[PDB]
Every structure is written in C-alpha cells, then in structure tokens.
Amino acid sequence: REIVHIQAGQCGNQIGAKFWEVISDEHGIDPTGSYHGDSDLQLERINVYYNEAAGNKYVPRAILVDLEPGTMDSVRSGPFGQIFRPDNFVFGQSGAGNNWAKGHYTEGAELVDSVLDVVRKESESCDCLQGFQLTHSLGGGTGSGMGTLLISKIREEYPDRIMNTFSVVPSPKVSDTVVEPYNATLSVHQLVENTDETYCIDNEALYDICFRTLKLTTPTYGDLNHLVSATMSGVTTCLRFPGQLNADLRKLAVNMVPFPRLHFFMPGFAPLTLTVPELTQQMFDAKNMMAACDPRHGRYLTVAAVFRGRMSMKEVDEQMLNVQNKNSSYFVEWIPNNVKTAVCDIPPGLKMSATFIGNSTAIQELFKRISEQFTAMFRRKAFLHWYTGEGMDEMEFTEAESNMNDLVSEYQQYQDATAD
Amino acid sequence: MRECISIHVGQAGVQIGNACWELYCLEHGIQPDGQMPSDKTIGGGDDSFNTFFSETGAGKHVPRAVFVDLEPTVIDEVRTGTYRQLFHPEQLITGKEDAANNYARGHYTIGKEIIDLVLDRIRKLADQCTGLQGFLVFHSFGGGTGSGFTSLLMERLSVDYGKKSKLEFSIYPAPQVSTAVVEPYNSILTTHTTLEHSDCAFMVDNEAIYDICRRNLDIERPTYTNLNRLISQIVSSITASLRFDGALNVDLTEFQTNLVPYPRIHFPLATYAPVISAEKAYHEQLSVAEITNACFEPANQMVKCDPRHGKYMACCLLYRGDVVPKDVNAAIATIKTKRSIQFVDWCPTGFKVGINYQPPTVVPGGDLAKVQRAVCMLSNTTAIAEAWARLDHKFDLMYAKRAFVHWYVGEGMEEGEFSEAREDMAALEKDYEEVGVDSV
Amino acid sequence: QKMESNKENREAHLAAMLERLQEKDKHAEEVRKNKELKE
Ligand SMILES: CNCCC(=O)N(C)[C@@H](C)C(=O)O[C@H]1CC(=O)N(C)c2cc(cc(OC)c2Cl)C/C(C)=C/C=C/[C@@H](OC)[C@@]2(O)C[C@H](OC(=O)N2)[C@@H](C)[C@@H]2O[C@@]12C
Ligand SMILES: Nc1nc2c(ncn2[C@@H]2O[C@H](COP(=O)(O)OP(=O)(O)OP(=O)(O)O)[C@@H](O)[C@H]2O)c(=O)[nH]1
Ligand SMILES: Nc1nc2c(ncn2[C@@H]2O[C@H](COP(=O)(O)OP(=O)(O)O)[C@@H](O)[C@H]2O)c(=O)[nH]1
Ligand SMILES: [Ca+2]
Ligand SMILES: [Mg+2]
Ligand SMILES: [Mg+2]
C-alpha cells in the first residue's frame, strides 16, 4: 500500500516538487489538499502517495531534505508548496558545496538523524508500507552524498522494504562543475549495493531532447524538469491507478531485476512535446530515451511499457508483438516473455502517451561515460584534497571506480550470453 | 451427505470462484440474498444441491466455500458486490501484503502468517458436513499466492484430512494475460510440491480460453471476465454430476476411477462444446452429433496440445440438457470410424457417458448463447504432457543463467528446491512417454 | 523441516545484510575520526 517519498538537495527538491504538482493534478487534489476531481479512479489508490487528514484533506507522504534552506524556501513558495506537511521540512544551514564527502560523512551525518525521525513518523502510521522512493542528483553533495547515506540508514531500519530512486546523472552539457564525475561514481557505488530499482535520469539525454527534438536553443532546468515530471508520472501510473501489472514496487522489481546489481533502468516517453503504431515505434526510439544510451548497442533483459488514454487494447497487443518480432535480436532469448504491457484509461494535456522502462545492457554506455570523466581527473588527483579534507582516503575512490567498472562488465556478460 | 468444500486462492482462484458461484446460484434458483423459494425444507436437507450449499434456519443457502488472498482488493469486491450476502464474512479471508509473484513468499514469508487461520475457517465448514467427500481448490500456477500459498495449503490439508479427495482447477499461464516473467518458476515449484497431495487436477490454459473467446465469441481482446464466464461453464459441467440428481447421471468419482490409471497421471484434458455467440446460435440448433464431434477438435480444448499425436487412456463424455443415450451412441459410432482416436494397448476403448437433464444456464450480460444441450469431454491423453514440456523449456532458459533466482533465495529458498522440482517434472514428462509405449 | 530450513536461511540473508550495513557505520566513524586527527 503506502510509499514514503524523500527529496534530497536542489535537483531532488526541484524534480520532487514538479512530481507532486503533476500527480496532484492527475488525482484531482488542489494546492490546499482538497479533492475536486470527477472520477472514482482518482481516489481508489490515493493512499499510496497521500495521507488523509482532518476535513478530507490529502497530504503528500513526502519528506523534503537539504543542507541549504534556499531551495526549500522556494518549494514552500511554489504553487503546491502549502500542500506539504510543515514538520516534513528538514534542513541545515551549512550547505554541501558539491562535496559528496560533506553530504555522506560530515555535514549530512549531522542532519540524517532528524530526517530518520520524520521517516519513522510517516512509516509508523502506514497500514502496510511498500517502501521508499528518493529523488536526487548524483552530481552535487547533498542529493548524492546525503541521499546515499539516507538509503543506507533507511535500509538498516526497513531491510525487507523496497528502495527505489530517481537518480539524475550529471553531464558536462548542463553543469560546468568539474567534480560531478567523482560525486556520481561515489554515489553509483552506494546505489549498486543498497537500492532495488534506480531510474537513470540522464541530464545528457534531457539536454539533447530539449535541443535536437524540441528545438530549444537554450534549455533551462525548467525545460529539463518538464521531461522528468512526464517520465515520473508515467513510471508511477501502475502504482497510482487500479491495474493488473507492476501495481506495487515489489512486483515491478521482480519483473524488472533478474540479477540484484542490474537494477538501473532506462526510462522513455512518447510523444515528445498520435496512432498506436506511432506511440510504440517512438517509445522504443533512442531519441525518446531519458538515458543517453542507444538500445541497439545492447540487449533488453526486461521491459515494462505503459500506454495511457482511450485506445484499442487489440492494436496495443498487436503492435507490442510487432516490435518484439521485428527487433528479436535486441531481447535476450533466455528470459522468455520479458516485455510486459499495461494500459491505463486516464491520459496525462494529451489524448494518448506511452512510458517505457527498460533494463538494457546498453546502460553500460552511461556508466562508461562517467568512468571516462572520473579517470581523466583521478589520474592527476585533481581537487581530491576537498574529499581527503573530510577524512576520506584515495582507496575509497579506487573501490568506487572498480565496482562501477564491475557493473559495466556484468551488463556485458549478460549481453554476450546465449541460450545454447 | 457427500459435501464438497471449495477453496479459492489468490486473484485467479477468487475471480473464477465469483463466476462459478454466480452460475451455480442461477442453475439452482438461488437469489443473491441466498433465498431459494423452490426449496421447501427450511434450514437443512440432503438434496443434491446441498453438496455445495449449506442452509441457515432463515432459509439462506450458503456456499461451502472459503476465499483466501494475501492482499484484500479482490476479496473486497466480493465483500461489497452483488453476492455479498451469500457468504458469511468468516468465509472471506485476506492479508495486507501479497506474495509479489513469488512462490517463496506465498509458501513461506507471507503464507505462514495466515495458514493457521485458513485451516481454522476450513475446519468450521468441515464440522457442518455429515459426510465430507473432499475439496475443490481453484488457483493460478503463475501468481505467488496461487502457486506458493496453494502448495502450503494442500500439504496442510493432507495432514489434517489424511486421504480425503483434493481436486484442483489450475490456471496455466499464457503470455497474452500474464503479469510475471517468473510464472514458469512458480508453475514448476507448485506442480512439484502439490503432485503427491492432489487426486486429480484440471489444467486450464489461459491461451486456449483466450483463443476460444477470440475465435468463437468474436471478442477482439478478451478480459478476465470473458475468460472466467467460459471457465465457469466448464467447471459447472464437471461439478453438475455432484449438484443434480438423474437416472443417467454419473458421479464425478466414477469418472475419476477411469481417468487416473496411476497416482501421478492425474491431469485430464477438458474439451467443451458448444461455445457460440447468440448471433450464430439464432436458428442454428446444434445436435448431439455436432457437439460430440466438436469435442475432438483441438481448438475447443482447455489446454493447447494435439491428442491426434498421443494416446488415450480414458475418454469420458459429460452431457447436459436435451440428450438421450440413443443419440449419444450414434454420435460415438460415427466419430470412431472418422477420427484419430488411438488408445494405449492396456486400456479398454469404451467411452464412459453421463447425462444430466438440467440444461446449461448463462449469466445475464454474457457472451455465450443459451443452448438446449452441451457436453464436456474429459480425456486422459499423453498429449497433455506437451503443456509441461512448454513450461519446462521456459524454466530451463531462465534457470541456466539463474535469472531472478535471488528473489526466491532472499525469501529463504535454496537452489536445491529448484533442481528437485525440475527433476520431478522431467520424471513426469518421462512417465507420460512410458504409459504410451506398447506392452511387450 | 522445510519451514525451519526456510526461516533459518531468510534470517541468515537478513543478518548478513545488517552485518554489511553495520561495517559501513564502522567505516564512517573511522572517516570522521581521520578528519579530527588531521586537524
Ligand atoms: C570558478 N567559478 C566558480 C565555480 C563554482 O562556484 N563552483 C562550481 C564550485 C562551487 C565548485 O564546486 O568547485 C569545484 C571545482 C569546479 O567545478 N570549478 C569550476 C572550479 C571552482 C573554483 C576554482 C577552479 O579552478 C580554476 C575550478 Cl575548475 C573555485 C573554488 C575552489 C571553489 C570552492 C568552493 C568550495 O566552497 C567553499 C566548495 O564548494 C568546493 C568543493 O568542496 C567544498 O567543500 N566546497 C569541491 C569538492 C569542488 O571541487 C571544486 C573545488
Ligand atoms: N483465467 C484467469 N486467469 C487469471 C485471473 N487473474 C489472474 N489470472 C492469471 O493468474 C496468473 C497470476 O496469478 P494471480 O492469481 O493474479 O496471482 P495471486 O495468486 O493473486 O498471487 P500474488 O498476487 O503474487 O500474491 C497469471 O497467469 C494471470 O493471467 C482471472 O481472473 N482469470
Ligand atoms: N535535471 C535537473 N538537474 C538538476 C536540477 N538542479 C540541479 N541539477 C543537476 O544536479 C547536479 C548538481 O546537484 P544539486 O542537486 O544541484 O546539488 P545538491 O543540492 O548538493 O544535491 C548537476 O549535475 C546539475 O546539472 C534540476 O532542477 N533538474
Ligand atoms: Ca432444504
Ligand atoms: Mg546546486
Ligand atoms: Mg494477487
């Protein structure tokens, strides 16, 4: 039943707030938490994401975390800012200065206990907690360093619950902060061991979609986050609306994760702002992927496709069979029937849309790109003193690099594997 | 006397139970409140319908049924739906957290928390029976609850009721309506653990029913509601001999003597006719010969396989409605001269026939035409082993790489249970080859 | 025998997960101590 949402750091809180705006609109919840919708389908699974309060108010099961108050003041002033529970705002004053070690070991460790107090309060009043979703970036210090610390501490107290992340991967095309590859490699080392499911939201891919496809000469964080919120609405549809397939976090994980470490998903969306054949072709197109990976450079272990809107279920089934038949080389033959399809009747300002979740061995392209940028700096020990200054040793960087190179090798192993 | 207790496990088991009990109420003239005006014996009796229905002093006819699911949302629709008054609240049992398509969760982690309560509620039904015959268990192979909780329950029922008969209706997975990649793991684990605990299992291939709905009822994209209405007609044909009287009526136990030559060889193939739309039935009366002929068309089978490429060990015809033995015997004589019906050399070739005079019923808003006569063929054929071979192959593809096995190991299962289950299936496939070889 | 073997194995899977998480908290004490003794 219940999911507990945590948003950590600037990126985490900005994409977190857009997530709540978008799904509050879909469920007919207004900024004061009152239900003013027209369909019983909107309320049937509302308790997954919302608590019920006095006077039939709906309150997001959301915890807002940062080491800096600025971004959370702007959330509180944002359109749906008054819907959040005031005691669920947990912020320090120090900031993390894009330093993973400050988030994970020093400043973040000081703040984490008061975050856990709020997590425990939200968890204790759940009829039957499914688990947790964290929104954060891997390139900064708070979302990256404190985000991964929180995951480790939550897992210690709720080890039998599912841990899901929306993890924004850094790109030189969007930030010119040069230590992002250090912070991302250190974060991936944590995520590989301590999450069940990670949506890889690549700032490289979002920038390229905004630039090449949507013809935006100068993409802002606003433009990037429009793609993120559409994706996040899409990949949580099956959790939030009555339905058969992947209707809870554990069932999604069991369908999507064949080996515990290979839990990094490439999300996709169509259309980018339409007939069923066109939705289906577009949702599988490299250009519609929210991770900068060519699926034709690897194989799909598992896929979830979610169609939204009024359309022919017969046409969706035929087209989903057509894509698998025509592209059979790109689906591993040793996981039979590895593509599942859901259709939800409620569309997101569109008549119809398709959301794609892929566990593809092509995700190694994202990790190799981070690995290349990590090495270029680490071989000259560039800016390391900001990390050793917080008590870290060089060896912890060597281990993070090896574990991420091992993850790449493991995707490669299952890509080359054969049934006979 | 001769009571049968139904147990509906997990979503598929529960939604199929809803369709079966709705249909039984319509067949016996029982209203959604449980009242049956035609029943003159208030608060009890030993009529044939009392095998499946108990009676309260207030004239309510209550299914001898338990519904179990590890999450509440499917059973909550029974609790608030049209037939909510039919069932006492204690017959409808729910947990909070489902088995997440994981046999290990259904059998061990979540299942252990509710098994003692379920056996308690079943004991309460058994204690109201003067001569309990046995249990009918409805479940999916593919779900975590349908697979793992059913296995646990069948083991516990063997302990608490010894050799009392246990019959299964088992939903075999199809890709058109499947919800989990691991269904083949769940199917083989539950088949292995249940096989010594079950007397007779009727497999229903969702793909066979799906295709019959598309081809014969012109449903573009069948839902569970479409599949379940058709499944309920086949279940009703099989249980009709327990629920109705008649001179030519042959008890299901007597068919079972013929259908099970060896304890492990207990999987009959069901074939049902006629499945026809109202628009096609209009001014087209299907005779005894036509519906009997249709039982030997593979496209009408509940499991996809080819009996023309295996051997019969048994053939039973269960007729309902306007059918007399003369027309049956002429139909059979015609079919013998024309069809690929090869028996093993150790089995007699006679078809065993039952006739129940009460015609088929249909549910309002259904897809099936109301017909004057119908037939269910139960055959014991070596061809049913094809269905095991398909599932075993999918199991082998995934298991060679240990794909998804960590989800089972995380819940306390060992690899050894996987290889033991798979070896039991290999030995079952081999048993089906051996019984088809000619005697020396 | 099956329900005992299962309970044992599940408990050993969880105990090892907690052993790995307790060593991270041990390593984090070592890092905050290394920072102190650097200053
Ligand atoms: C030069 N336009 C300002 C750029 C700027 O403000 N940025 C991006 C800062 C915040 C920044 O992250 O600097 C990074 C380096 C970087 O990306 N670039 C652009 C940079 C930045 C500087 C000089 C440079 O050399 C020419 C370069 Cl190349 C200027 C410096 C040294 C800023 C240091 C800020 C610290 O805050 C007190 C810090 O945020 C840094 C932090 O540690 C922390 O604990 N906090 C460590 C881990 C960061 O590694 C670094 C150094
Ligand atoms: N014919 C039919 N098949 C169904 C129905 N519901 C589910 N199935 C099938 O059953 C399998 C899935 O198992 P379910 O019964 O949904 O799962 P469950 O027993 O509730 O188990 P968990 O949900 O994992 O706890 C798949 O093969 C589905 O296609 C139904 O009403 N009718
Ligand atoms: N897509 C997206 N990326 C962001 C946003 N805000 C920051 N980022 C990215 O986040 C990384 C820096 O992390 P940030 O969240 O700003 O640092 P923190 O506040 O210490 O967690 C960089 O790669 C930025 O490009 C946002 O609103 N949207
Ligand atoms: Ca009576
Ligand atoms: Mg920032
Ligand atoms: Mg279920």
DSSP result, B366-421 = -SSPP-SEEEEEEEEEGGGHHHHHHHHHHHHHHHTTTTTHHHHHTTT--HHHHHHH
**For helices A276-283 and A313-326, what crossing angle results, to 10°?**
40
* Ligand 3 binding site (Cβ under 6 Å of any ligand atom): A 9-11, 14-15, 96, 98, 137, 139-143, 168, 170, 174-175, 180, 203, 206, 221, 224-225, 228
**For helices A9-26 and A221-240, what crossing angle results, to 10°?**
50
Give per-residue burial for A128-150: e unless 16+ CB within 10 Å, then b.
Answer: ebbbbbbbbbbbbbbbbbbbbbb
Decide: helix, strand or coil at residue B270. Answer: strand
Helical ranges in B1-96 per DSSP H: 10-28, 73-80
Could you tell me which of A317, A405, A410, A324 has the C-alpha nearest to residue A361?
A410
- Distance in angstroms (rounded) separating the CA atoms of residues C39 and C30: 15
- With beta carbons less than 8 A apart as the criterion, state whether A230 and A349 touch: no
Does residue A190 lie in a domain region?
yes
Could you tell me which of B243, B296, B252, B304 has the C-alpha nearest to residue B273?
B296
For chain C, what is the radius of gyration of the CA atoms?
Answer: 17
Phi, psi of A383 (to 5 degrees): 65, 15
Does residue A76 lie in a domain region?
yes
Q: List C-alpha distances in Å: B413 to B109, B140, B407.
A: 10, 21, 9
Phi, psi of B356 (to 5 degrees): -110, 125
Cβ of B99 closer than 6 Å to ligand 2, yes or no, is yes
Give per-residue burial for B151-173: e unless 16+ CB within 10 Å, then b.
Answer: bbbbbbbbeebeeebbbbbbbbb
Sheet with B165-172: list strands edge to edge.
B92-94, B65-69, B4-9, B134-140, B165-172, B200-205
Are A163 and A241 contained in the same domain? yes
- With beta carbons less than 8 A apart as the criterion, state whether A20 and A147 touch: no
- Distance in angstroms (rounded) separating the CA atoms of residues B125 and B116: 15
Give per-residue burial for B268-303: e unless 16+ CB within 10 Å, then b.
Answer: bbbbbbbbbeeeebeeeebebeebbbbbbeeebbbb
User: Tokens in use for A68?
Assistant: 């800096």
Decide: helix, strand or coil at residue B318. Answer: strand
Residue B308: CB atoms within 10 A of its CB come to 13
Decide: helix, strand or coil at residue B198. Answer: coil
User: Tokens in use for A384?
Assistant: 């390391």
Strand partners, A162: A131
Establish if A325 touches chain B: CB-CB under 8 angstroms: no
- Distance in angstroms (rounded) separating the CA atoms of residues B155 and A238: 35
- Tell me which residue has tokens 């051997």: B311
Name the binding residues of B: 10-12, 15, 71, 99, 140, 143-146, 179, 183, 206, 224, 228, 252
Phi, psi of A60 (to 5 degrees): -50, 135
Are A115 and A251 contained in the same domain? yes
Cβ of A96 closer than 6 Å to ligand 1, yes or no, is no
- Distance in angstroms (rounded) separating the CA atoms of residues B177 and A45: 22
By DSSP bridging, strand B373-381 and strand B312-321 are: antiparallel
- Burial classification of residue A97, based on how many CB atoms lie within 10 Å of its CB (0-12 exposed, 13-18 middle, 19 or more buried): middle
For chain B, what is the radius of gyration of the CA atoms?
Answer: 21
Could you tell me which of A236, A203, A255 has the C-alpha nearest to residue A133?
A236
Cβ of B236 closer than 6 Å to ligand 2, yes or no, is no
- Distance in angstroms (rounded) separating the CA atoms of residues B28 and B243: 9
- Distance in angstroms (rounded) separating the CA atoms of residues A304 and A231: 13
Q: Which of A215, A237, A264 is the last residue of a domain?
A: A264
Q: Left (φ > 0), alpha (ψ -120 to 50) or beta: where does A55 sit?
A: left
- With beta carbons less than 8 A apart as the criterion, state whether A397 and C38 touch: no
**For helices B183-194 and B150-161, what crossing angle results, to 10°?**
10
Are A256 and A330 contained in the same domain? no
Are A270 and A216 contained in the same domain? no
- Tell me the one-letter amino acid at A21: E
Q: Is A142 marked as binding a ligand? A: yes
- Tell me which residue has tokens 């950590």: A8
CB < 8 Å to C25, chain A: 156
- Distance in angstroms (rounded) separating the CA atoms of residues B36 and B55: 10
Are A228 and A305 contained in the same domain? no
* Pocket test residue of A142, A174, A177 for ligand 1, highest count of atoms within 8 A of CB: A177
How many CA within 13 A on the CB side of residue B286?
22
Establish if A381 touches chain B: CB-CB under 8 angstroms: no
Q: Has B254 been annotated as catalytic? A: yes
CATH number of B3-259: 3.40.50.1440
Does residue A414 lie in a domain region?
no
Q: Which CATH number covers residue A275?
A: 3.30.1330.20
By DSSP bridging, strand A264-270 and strand A197-202 are: parallel
Sheet with B352-356: list strands edge to edge.
B269-273, B373-381, B312-321, B352-356
Supply the DSSP symbol for B91.
Answer: G
Phi, psi of B302 (to 5 degrees): -80, -15
B interface residues, A as partner, C-beta within 8 Å: 96-98, 100-102, 175-176, 178-182, 184, 220-221, 394, 397-398, 400-404, 406-407
Are A26 and A144 contained in the same domain? yes
Residue A51: CB atoms within 10 A of its CB come to 18
- With beta carbons less than 8 A apart as the criterion, state whether B344 and B312 touch: yes
First to last CA, chain A: 41
- Distance in angstroms (rounded) separating the CA atoms of residues A303 and A354: 13
User: Tokens in use for B278?
Assistant: 């109202």
Establish if A86 touches chain C: CB-CB under 8 angstroms: no
Peptide bond into B274 cis (omega under 30): yes
Q: List C-alpha distances in Å: B161 to A278, B126, B134, B197, B338.
A: 58, 10, 9, 11, 46
By DSSP bridging, strand A89-91 and strand A131-137 are: unpaired
User: Which atom of ligand 2 has the smallest separation from the CA of B98?
Assistant: 25
- With beta carbons less than 8 A apart as the criterion, state whether A105 and C31 touch: yes
- With beta carbons less than 8 A apart as the criterion, state whether B418 and B398 touch: no
Interruptions in chain A after residues (C–N over 2.5 Å): 273, 348
Measured in whole angstroms, the distance separating CA A152 from the mean position of its chain's CA atoms is: 17
Q: List C-alpha distances in Å: A126 to A56, A57, A64, A252.
A: 18, 17, 19, 21
Q: Do B398 and A335 touch (CB under 8 A)?
A: yes
Could you tell me which of A196, A180, A117, A115 has the C-alpha nearest to residue A149?
A115
Cβ of B168 closer than 6 Å to ligand 2, yes or no, is no
- Tell me the one-letter amino acid at B140: S
Cβ of A236 closer than 6 Å to ligand 1, yes or no, is no
Q: Which of A264, A291, A311 is the last residue of a domain?
A: A264
- Distance in angstroms (rounded) separating the CA atoms of residues A85 and A282: 39
Does residue A144 lie in a domain region?
yes
User: Tokens in use for B76?
Assistant: 């909550």
CATH number of B269-386: 3.30.1330.20
CB < 8 Å to B102, chain A: 254
Strand partners, A163: A132
Nearest Cα residue to atom 25 of ligand 3: A175
- Distance in angstroms (rounded) separating the CA atoms of residues B156 and B163: 12
User: What does the domain layout of chain B look like in residue ranges?
Assistant: 3-259, 269-386
Q: What angle do CA A222, A224, A228 make, to 5 degrees?
A: 105
3-state secondary structure chain A: CCEEEEEEHHHHHHHHHHHHHHHHHHCCECCCCEECCCCHHHCCCHHHCEEEECCCEEEECEEEEECCCHHHHHHHHCCCHHHCCHHHEEECCCCCCCCHHHHHCCHHHHHHHHHHHHHHHHHHCCCCCCEEEEEEECCCCHHHHHHHHHHHHHHHHCCCCEEEEEEEECCCCCCCCCCHHHHHHHHHHHHHHHCCEEEEEEHHHHHHHHHHHCCCCCCCHHHHHHHHHHHHHHHHHHHHCCCCCCCCHHHHHHHHCCCCCCCEEEEEEECCCCCHHHHHHHHCCHHHECCCCCHHHCCEEEEEEEEEECCCHHHHHHHHHHHHHHCHHHECCCCCCCEEEEEECCCCCCCEEEEEEEEEHHHHHHHHHHHHHHHHHHCCCCCCHHHHCCCCCHHHHHHHHHHHHHHHHHHHHHHHCCCC
- With beta carbons less than 8 A apart as the criterion, state whether A74 and A48 touch: no
- With beta carbons less than 8 A apart as the criterion, state whether B184 and B315 touch: no
- Tell me which residue has tokens 């964080």: A221
- With beta carbons less than 8 A apart as the criterion, state whether A96 and A147 touch: no
Residue B438: CB atoms within 10 A of its CB come to 8
Could you tell me which of B136, B143, B131 has the C-alpha nearest to residue B172?
B143
Does residue A409 lie in a domain region?
no
- Distance in angstroms (rounded) separating the CA atoms of residues B220 and A201: 37
Q: Which of A332, A364, A396 is the last residue of a domain?
A: A364
Contacts of B427 by beta carbon, 8 Å cutoff, 6+ apart: none
Mutate one of B74, B179, B390, B398 to test the A interface: name it (highest A CB count within 10 A). Answer: B179
Q: Rounded to the nearest 10 degrees, how much is the dihedral formed by the CA atoms of B262, B268, B269, B274?
A: 140
- With beta carbons less than 8 A apart as the criterion, state whether A5 and A84 touch: no
User: Tokens in use for B362?
Assistant: 């249909």
Domain pair B3-259 / B269-386, same fold: no
How many CA within 13 A on the CB side of residue B311?
15
By DSSP bridging, strand A300-309 and strand A352-360 are: antiparallel
How many CA within 13 A on the CB side of residue A286?
14
Range of the domain at A32: 2-264
Residue B204: CB atoms within 10 A of its CB come to 24
Contacts of B77 by beta carbon, 8 Å cutoff, 6+ apart: B18
Are A154 and A275 contained in the same domain? no
Decide: helix, strand or coil at residue B65. Answer: strand
- With beta carbons less than 8 A apart as the criterion, state whether B186 and B148 touch: yes
- Tell me the one-letter amino acid at A327: N
- With beta carbons less than 8 A apart as the criterion, state whether A308 and A234 touch: yes
Are A180 and A193 contained in the same domain? yes
- Tell me the one-letter amino acid at A183: N
- Name residues with Cβ closer than 5 Å to ligand 4, which is an ion: B 39, 41, 45
Beta strand segments in B250-350, E: 269-273, 312-321
Which candidate in B254, B414, B415, B434 is catalytic? B254
- Distance in angstroms (rounded) separating the CA atoms of residues B110 and B324: 51
Phi, psi of A58 (to 5 degrees): -110, 125
Q: B184 vs chain A: nearest CA distance in angstroms?
A: 9
**In what helix (H) or strand (E) does residue C7 lie, and over which residues does it extend?**
helix C2-36
User: Tokens in use for A111?
Assistant: 């703040």
Contacts of B261 by beta carbon, 8 Å cutoff, 6+ apart: B313, B314, B347, B380, B435
DSSP B222-234: --HHHHHHHHHHH
Could you tell me which of A224, A220, A249 has the C-alpha nearest to residue A357?
A249
Does residue A327 lie in a domain region?
yes
Helical ranges in B203-312 per DSSP H: 206-217, 224-243, 252-259, 278-281, 288-294
Contacts of B108 by beta carbon, 8 Å cutoff, 6+ apart: B148, B411, B412, B413, C3, C6, C7, C10
Q: Do A259 and B394 touch (CB under 8 A)?
A: no
- With beta carbons less than 8 A apart as the criterion, state whether B189 and B425 touch: no
Supply the DSSP symbol for B148.
Answer: I
Could you tell me which of B248, B250, B154, B229 has the C-alpha nearest to residue B197?
B154
User: Which atom of ligand 2 has the smallest separation from the CA of B173?
Assistant: 27
Does residue A397 lie in a domain region?
no
Strand partners, B93: B68
For A127, the closest chain B residue by CA position comes to B96
- Tell me the one-letter amino acid at A246: N
Does residue A65 lie in a domain region?
yes
Strand partners, A18: none
- Distance in angstroms (rounded) separating the CA atoms of residues B161 and A142: 61
User: Tokens in use for C19?
Assistant: 């052993």
Q: C22 vs chain B: nearest CA distance in angstroms?
A: 19
State how many domains chain A has. Answer: 2
Decide: helix, strand or coil at residue C13. Answer: helix
- With beta carbons less than 8 A apart as the criterion, state whether B248 and B354 touch: yes
Are A89 and A223 contained in the same domain? yes
